[model samples]
Target: FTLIELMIVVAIIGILAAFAIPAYNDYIARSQAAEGLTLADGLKVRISDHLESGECKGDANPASGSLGNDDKGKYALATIDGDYNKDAKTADEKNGCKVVITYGQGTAGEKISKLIVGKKLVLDQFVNGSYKYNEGETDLELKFIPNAVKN
Candidate 1:
C-alpha cells in the first residue's frame, strides 16, 4: 500500500516543484537586489533636490555622502553617474545618465545564482517620480524583480 501510493506522490511533486522553484529563485534575487535600493533611492532624492534647487551639474554623483556610490555590499555595488545637464529639450536629455547595480560580483558572489549573477539592474532615467529600468532585456535583466516601482 505504501510503495504504490508513494509512486504517484513523487510523480506529482515534480510538476509542481518546477514551476514553484523558478518563482522562489526570482524572489531570492529580488531580495538580494533590494540591497541597492536605498542607495539608488537616496541618490534619486538628491538628484531631484539638486534640480529643484535650480542646479543641474554638480555633486549629484557617487561621491562622499551617506549615499556613496562606492558603498559596495557583498551582493551589490551601486554606481551612479549623471548630471542632468543636457540639451534641455527632449526626454532623453532629461535622463542623460543612470545608476547601475552590478549583482553578485562582490565578496559573497557564490551566494547569488548564475541566473542573477553577472546580471545588471540598470536604473536609468529618473523621471516622473521614479527611475526607469532601462526597459530592456540586457541592462534590465531583473525583468521581474526588485526595489520600488510605486508612482
Candidate 2:
C-alpha cells in the first residue's frame, strides 16, 4: 500500500512539472522582453519632446545622450530616424521616426531584436542580423536602417 502511494505521489509530481516547466519558460521569456524594453524606456519621451518642440527636423538622429544601454547590457539602441513637421497634427502626418533596439543572445543562444515606432513595439525577432526598410516590405516612411553589422 505504501509503494502504491509513493508511485501516485511521483506521478503527481511529474504531471506538475510538465505544466510548470512551460509556464516558467514563458515567464522567463516575457521578463527578458521587458528587460529589453526597459533599455529604451526614456527614449520615447525624448522623442516626443523633440517632436512637440519642432526640434526633431527631417531625418535627424534623435539624441540618445548616453542613455542607450540597459544596466544588464542585454540591449542597445541601434538607430533612430524620423521626420518631424511642426505643422503636422499627428505622428503619421509628421512621418514619425523609427527606433531599433538590438538584444544580445538569449538564454538558448538565439539573437533577438525589437523595432519601435512612436512608443509602439513594431517588430520583434529571434533571428540574428539586421533588417532594412524596403519600400512596401518594411517601409516605415521615415524609417532609418543603419549599416548591417555582420555579427
Candidate 3:
C-alpha cells in the first residue's frame, strides 16, 4: 500500500459511495412503492366498470367490489384505497374515482427512509362510460424527496 495507491483508491471509492448510496435508496423505495400502484390498477378497473354500468360510486356509493386488503409491502405501509369523486361541477367528473397509496407509516413503512415517510401516491381516474384509466384530474403526482442531500 504505497501512499499514491492509498490516496487514489480511497478517492475513487469515496466518491462512488457518496453518490450511489442515496440513489440506491431511491431505487428501492420506488420498487417497493410500486406495489401501491399495481394494486390501484385493479381499483381503477372496478371503478371504470361501475361507471360503464351507468353508475357513479361516490360517498353515496362504493366500488361495487373489494380488494383482499393486502395493500402493505416493504415500502408501502398503508392499505391502498379508492372511491368516487362526487363533488364535481361536471357530470362526467362525478364518474371518476381516486385511489390513494400511502407509504412509510407502519412497520414495513418504517423500513423506508425518512425522505419518503408519509408520502402518498394518488391515482385518480376519470370516466366517459368507456373505462378510460385517465390520469388524475388534479394530477395524482407521486413525489419522492431526493436523498442526495441526506446521505
Instruction: Write one digit per residue (lDDT tens) for candidate 1, span 74-96.
Output: 77676666556544555433455
Give the TM-score (vs. native) of candidate 2. Answer: 0.46
Instruction: Give the lDDT of residue 93 in candidate 1.
Output: 37
Question: Of the pair 1 and 3, which is ahead by lDDT?
Answer: 1
Q: Report the C-alpha lDDT of model 3 over 90-127, residue by residue, as the tens digit.
A: 63563445555566654574666665567665544444
- On lDDT, the leading prediction is 1
Best by TM-score: 1
Question: Model 3 off-target regions past 4 Å?
Answer: 45-70, 77-94, 128-151
Error of 3 at 52 (Å): 8.7
Give TM per candidate.
0.66, 0.46, 0.57
Tell me how candidate 2 scores on lDDT: 0.39
Cα RMSDs, all models: 4.6, 11.6, 7.5
lDDT of 2 at 65: 40
lDDT of each: 0.60, 0.39, 0.50
Could you tell which candidate, 1 or 2, scores higher by lDDT? 1
